[PDB]
């Protein structure tokens, strides 16, 4: 697998789609 | 946390897809153990 790919959402081309749960999951981790 | 030159050699021998992992390895604050052998095979270098 590619190393450079980030861990939050899926990547298609240059567009990175983040589901609404994942941005909530980061806000849960901060709190 | 040390990295042998065989390990740096295999990370460089892998292509430019692994340039980020190469830069991470090439962080300056770590010890670089130079190796005195031929093949640059990381498994046999580490085991010896």
């Amino acid at each position: 697998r590619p190393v450079d790919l980030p861990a939050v959402g899926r990547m298609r081309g240059a567009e990175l789609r983040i589901s609404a749960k994942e941005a909530a999951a980061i806000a849960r981790e901060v709190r | 946390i040390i990295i042998t030159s065989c390990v740096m050699a295999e990370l460089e021998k892998l292509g430019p897809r692994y340039r980020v992992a190469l830069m991470i390895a090439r962080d300056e604050r770590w010890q670089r153990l130079t190796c005195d052998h031929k093949g640059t095979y990381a498994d046999d270098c580490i085991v010896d």
Partner: protein, 347 residues
């Protein structure tokens, strides 16, 4: 072809990001420096290649140009502005001893042969010339209505006070330092990455250009190229004449170093390596026997020209056998079997 073994070594652990500028000391013989892409410069000693002699986190951005002064000190450009350090001092000093920010974004440096003068190529379409120890802002020489950035700058080492420059108008421009004005400007077809002069013939120059090509020009008559070296695949990033003035190194934007004779027009040698990621700056040592390659893998590599010719002291019946073989290949090198074996190289 059996004893062609050109790779000799690698200077230290290398850099972290790629080597985007490097410069030798033209007075000494073992003083190299190289500035990387994360803005750290290192001064290397070629006799002890195990570790660097002096390193500093110089700038913020990449180090675009770098040079040595004639005394002992070194200069470095960036988009920050140029700085001066003393890398050979009895305490190590990380801090610079002079800095210069006014004059737009600088791109390259070139030091004079004799005096303490140097010219920095900026991005405002001008070069500007400082004399150390009695000049502060320098004198800005420019083509009168010029906007595009001057990429490279090179003092002519033979004829002092003649400065060549390339610019992203696909043009080369000259400069006479004695009467401070530009001299002549020619527009080529493609952009030129780097100008360089011949250290034995004062009038000949070479431009490494995005046409995958090296053009050897005469500075008196810019009508036609004296020679056109065409062997590359991607753009040529750096060209450097040998200090004997009869050979050339070119590091290209693909993974190749190409060694050339001066009248050849085609490759004498090609050097490549799976670990070498791109090639940005290639330059000879002042022996004219070994070449150095600053890559995008963060590595400065030391190759040799004349890949099958070993150095050191030879016995007479050893160097006579080598000279006899070279003369015999000069005669019978064009026959078919000899030709195919001497041209075969693994790319």
């Amino acid at each position: 072809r059996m004893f062609a073994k050109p790779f000799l070594g690698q200077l230290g652990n290398g850099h972290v990001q790629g080597v985007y500028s490097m410069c030798k000391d033209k007075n000494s013989l073992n003083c190299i420096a190289s500035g990387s892409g994360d803005g750290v410069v290192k001064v290397w000693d070629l006799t002890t290649r195990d570790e660097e002699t002096w390193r500093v986190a110089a700038h913020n951005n990449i180090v675009k140009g770098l040079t040595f002064t004639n005394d002992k000190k070194l200069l470095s450009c960036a988009t920050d502005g140029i700085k001066l350090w003393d890398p050979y001092a009895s305490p190590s000093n990380t801090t610079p001893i002079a800095t210069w920010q006014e004059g737009g974004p600088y791109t390259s440096l070139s030091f004079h042969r004799s005096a303490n003068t140097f010219a920095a190529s900026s991005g405002q379409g001008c070069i500007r010339i400082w004399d150390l120890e009695h000049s502060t802002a320098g004198q800005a020489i420019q083509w009168p209505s010029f906007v595009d950035t001057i990429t490279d700058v090179c003092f002519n080492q033979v004829e002092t006070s003649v400065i060549g420059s390339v610019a992203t108008d696909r043009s080369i421009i000259l400069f006479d330092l004695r009467t401070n004005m530009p001299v002549i400007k020619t527009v080529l077809h493609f952009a030129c990455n780097r100008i360089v002069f011949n250290p034995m013939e004062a009038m000949n120059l070479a431009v490494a250009s995005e046409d995958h090509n090296i053009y050897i020009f005469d500075a008196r008559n810019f009508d036609k190229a004296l020679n056109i070296q065409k062997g590359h695949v991607a753009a040529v990033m750096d060209v450097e004449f040998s200090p004997t003035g009869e050979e050339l190194v070119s590091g290209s934007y693909d993974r190749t170093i190409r060694l050339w004779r001066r009248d050849a027009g085609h490759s004498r040698d090609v050097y490549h390596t799976k670990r070498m990621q791109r090639v940005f700056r290639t330059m000879w040592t002042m022996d004219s026997k070994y070449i150095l390659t600053g890559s995008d893998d963060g590595n400065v590599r030391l190759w040799r020209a004349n890949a099958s010719e070993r150095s050191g002291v030879k016995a007479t019946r050893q160097r006579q056998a080598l000279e006899y073989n070279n003369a015999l290949l000069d005669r019978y090198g064009h026959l078919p079997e000899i030709r195919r074996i001497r041209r075969h190289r693994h790319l």
